[PDB]
């Protein structure tokens, strides 16, 4: 490890001697900074012994007023003749040790001598710069590209249940913050106002206030994650402006009357049967706000739904059945118990692999404009499930790889016209052509139930 002048450390065992060195260090630096060129050349760069100017560096003695040159070794001689071993370079204020034959550059209190009077605090209450930050070298982290939000937002604001809700002023009527930069739902409501209402100048304020509110709430890629994020915020804000503490729980644990929960929530039935005896314990009823479908090796959405509602096998060892003691593998099936008014399907296209690896499945999957869910619902007796038909109103598509990668929204408006929303570009588009897209999120609204 690098070493420190033992002589100067030796001097600093004594308190007075230490203070005195630092007074002299400040005074010499003071003089060098407050001295006109001619007085600098004659009194700090003039060798006391040879009377020459700039015979190399000239050093100001730390212990008398002697100045001595380097090139003819007159400070060295001074140091040998009277034992004053320390001097200051009059060009730079740097302290030299003529026994070490080197400068004392690695002592903080000498370098920073202007703080001598308060060193105890300085060195106890502040630390040196870490090695990594000392030069301020760092890339600057932007927000990222924002189309994974754009594209969800377009779907939300062409959603008839959400538009109706926004336009009813219900949040406006109940919000306690009443401003867009602070409340997320206020920001959503502002998007609506810019898009559908009036000014009284880019229709972009809503969006910017919303981006901002989002990141303040959550410091930080995935459109689907942003969908889940938005919907939670919406719910969170219904709970926040509710009269009670008993109702906060019933709404957050049992039954919620928010727009999110009364339009996007269904219920799955997960049945675990014994294949030997038929014990139906246990089966659970769990909510969902979307369904994530597998797509490997599938060409059609109905094939994806089929796979999701097919009978699996649970190999969970150390198992035996309750009534019949069979260690045989338990059958699991997933089935819909309650449908939502709006069914949001997600096509799993992003495999996250280990380390940093990943993969995009670009497989085309046929999706219908009208989708019938009768075959994916649970209950010999005629409780044969009637037609329950949804209509496609929105798609979100992704192009590129997983890391870099761009999103696009499609939305059907009144009269059955489709528009393609590519950030700022909004163009019309035929159904034929929308139905050829690589869907990642599909948005289906309930149309007919027999």
């Amino acid at each position: 490890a690098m070493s420190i002048c033992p002589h100067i450390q030796q001097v600093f065992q004594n308190e007075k001697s230490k203070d005195g060195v630092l007074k002299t260090c400040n005074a010499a630096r003071y003089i060098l900074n407050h001295s006109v060129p001619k007085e600098k050349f004659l009194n700090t760069m003039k060798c006391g012994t040879c009377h020459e100017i700039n015979s190399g560096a000239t050093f100001m003695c730390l212990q008398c007023g002697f100045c001595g040159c380097w090139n003819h070794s007159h400070f060295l001689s001074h140091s040998k003749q009277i034992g004053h071993i320390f001097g200051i370079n009059s060009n730079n204020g740097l302290l030299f040790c003529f026994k070490c034959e080197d400068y004392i550059g690695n002592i903080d209190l000498i370098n920073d001598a202007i703080l001598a009077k308060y060193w105890d605090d300085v060195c106890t209450k502040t630390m040196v710069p870490s090695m990594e930050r000392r030069d301020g070298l760092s890339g600057l982290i932007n927000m990222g590209n924002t189309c994974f939000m754009s594209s969800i937002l377009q779907c939300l604001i062409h959603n008839p249940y959400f538009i109706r809700h926004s336009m009813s002023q219900i949040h406006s009527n109940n919000c306690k913050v009443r401003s867009p930069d602070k409340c997320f739902s206020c920001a959503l409501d502002k998007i609506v106002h810019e898009l559908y209402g009036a000014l009284n100048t880019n229709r972009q304020t809503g969006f910017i206030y919303l981006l901002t509110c989002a990141w303040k709430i959550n410091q930080n890629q995935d459109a689907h994650e942003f969908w889940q994020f938005i919907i939670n915020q919406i719910h969170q804000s219904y709970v926040l402006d509710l009269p009670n503490a008993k109702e906060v729980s019933r709404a957050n644990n049992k039954q919620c009357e928010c727009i999110v929960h009364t339009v996007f929530e269904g219920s799955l039935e997960s049945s675990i049967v014994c294949p030997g005896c038929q014990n139906n314990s246990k089966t659970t009823i769990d909510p969902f706000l979307d369904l994530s479908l597998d797509i490997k090796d599938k060409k059609k959405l109905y094939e994806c739904l089929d796979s999701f509602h097919k009978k699996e096998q649970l190999k969970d060892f150390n198992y035996h059945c309750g009534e019949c003691n069979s260690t045989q593998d338990a059958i699991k099936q997933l089935g819909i118990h309650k449908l939502p008014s709006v069914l949001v399907l997600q096509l799993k296209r992003f495999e996250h692999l280990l380390n940093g690896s990943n993969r995009k499945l670009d497989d085309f999957i046929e999706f219908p404009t009208y989708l019938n869910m009768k075959n994916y619902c649970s209950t010999s007796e005629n409780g044969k499930v009637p037609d329950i038909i949804y209509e496609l109103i929105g798609i979100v598509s992704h192009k590129g790889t997983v890391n870099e990668g761009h999103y696009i929204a499609f939305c059907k408006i009144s009269g059955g016209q489709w528009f393609k929303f590519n950030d700022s570009m909004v163009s019309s588009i035929s159904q034929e052509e929308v139905l050829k897209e690589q869907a990642y999120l599909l948005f289906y609204t309930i149309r007919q139930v027999n």
Partner: protein, 41 residues
């Protein structure tokens, strides 16, 4: 013994060597501060 050319060169030599010795002192001390303050680099 002592020419105008010669004592001109003494004066230039003084200026140069002074300037060099100042550049070098700022570099050596600086690196020395970095090696003491940070064992690993």
């Amino acid at each position: 013994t002592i020419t105008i050319d010669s004592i001109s060169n003494g004066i230039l030599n003084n200026l140069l060597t002074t300037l060099i010795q100042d550049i070098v002192a700022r570099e050596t001390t600086q690196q020395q501060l970095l090696k003491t303050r940070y064992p690993d680099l």
